Design a protein around this ligand. Structure first.
Ligand SMILES: Cc1noc(C)c1-c1cc(O)cc([C@H](O)C2CC2)c1
Length: 127
């Protein structure tokens, strides 16, 4: 059994910025989700070997997780907030695509996603 390489978190030739919106995504959005009781399955890439999910990376072709997003934010990987918001949405969508309604992991994702939506509703206007 084999995991793919993780998503990219470093690329010196990708242009990047540290906008007030990106700072909010780290300080408010990531921090809020990371500390939640249901964060743990989302704090690193899905390990299809350890979890015995040999079909996971056949079904999910754009993997994403908050460990990756945390590294991207800490490393100032992004150009804009939309890039980062897309990563959170990819993470949630992947979970809904792979799993069944009512599974524990789906309930966990839905709780995180409610908080995510509440926090990005107050994304600040760009400085
Ligand atoms: C994310 C994700 N997407 O699909 C699956 C399956 C997971 C997943 C990842 C984990 O690191 C651990 C678990 C456990 O089953 C948790 C729910 C009790 C699930």
């Amino acid at each position: 059994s084999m995991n793919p390489p993780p998503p990219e978190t470093s690329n010196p030739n990708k242009p990047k910025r540290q906008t007030n919106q990106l700072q909010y995504l780290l300080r408010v959005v990531l921090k809020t989700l990371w500390k939640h009781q249901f964060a743990w399955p989302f704090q690193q890439p899905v390990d299809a070997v350890k979890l015995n999910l040999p079909d996971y990376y056949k079904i999910i072709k754009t993997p994403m997780d908050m460990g990756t997003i945390k590294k991207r934010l800490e490393n100032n990987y992004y150009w804009n907030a939309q890039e980062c918001i897309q990563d959170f949405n990819t993470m949630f969508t992947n979970c809904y695509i792979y799993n069944k309604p009512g599974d524990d992991i789906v309930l966990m994702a839905e709780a995180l996603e409610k908080l995510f939506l509440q926090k990005i509703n107050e994304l600040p206007t760009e400085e």
